[PDB]
Amino acid sequence: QRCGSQGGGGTCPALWCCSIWGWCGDSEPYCGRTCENKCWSGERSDHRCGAAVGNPPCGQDRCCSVHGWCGGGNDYCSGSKCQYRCSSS
Amino acid sequence: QRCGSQGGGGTCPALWCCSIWGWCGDSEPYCGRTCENKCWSGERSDHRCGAAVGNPPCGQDRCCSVHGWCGGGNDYCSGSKCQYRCSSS
Ligand SMILES: [Zn+2]
Numbered sequence: 190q191r192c193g194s195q196g197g198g199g200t201c202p203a204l205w206c207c208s209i210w211g212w213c214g215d216s217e218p219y220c221g222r223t224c225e226n227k228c229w230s231g232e233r234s235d236h237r238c239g240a241a242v243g244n245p246p247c248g249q250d251r252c253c254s255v256h257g258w259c260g261g262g263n264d265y266c267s268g269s270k271c272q273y274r275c276s277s278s
Numbered sequence: 279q280r281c282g283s284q285g286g287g288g289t290c291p292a293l294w295c296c297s298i299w300g301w302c303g304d305s306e307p308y309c310g311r312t313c314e315n316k317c318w319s320g321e322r323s324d325h326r327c328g329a330a331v332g333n334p335p336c337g338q339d340r341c342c343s344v345h346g347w348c349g350g351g352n353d354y355c356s357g358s359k360c361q362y363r364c365s366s367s
Pocket residue numbers: 254256323324325
């Protein structure tokens with residue numbers, strides 16, 4: 190899926206990272222050094238996530254729980270406990 | 279100090295746990311299975327704490343920060359970041 194200034198301005202599904210080349214992913218090429226948006230580095234200082242705080246990203250191997258907190262592991266990342274960037278599932 | 283039904287009906291200092299014997303603490307006999315009030319099990323799902331949500335407990339090894347949130351580690355528990363149930367170094 191395309192996204193970003195190169196892809197047309199779409200947002201990635203499950204709010205994944207849009208690389209600078211305009212493609213969606215969740216690995217370093219997309220989320221680290223060559224990320225354009227919803228980058229690992231864009232996680233709020235307070236680590237909250239969700240619609241309440243405008244759907245910000247979470248860092249590497251961290252997901253946005255359904256309670257609105259970024260963090261890692263099943264409790265944040267496994268289905269129904271996870272709202273986006275889910276990665277455990 | 280004394281708290282709860284056996285101890286006067288007060289809340290502990292630093293909103294710590296009141297055991298079933300009416301004494302204040304922060305270890306498992308106080309906060310765990312034999313806890314009467316402000317127990318580890320009473321953390322709100324939304325993780326809020328502070329007086330605007332009526333001084334809820336925080337879970338185990340979590341502290342209420344000055345920002346109104348329960349969580350683990352130095353953002354919530356360290357000296358100047360913590361308002362109650364503070365414990366980290
Ligand atoms: Zn939670």
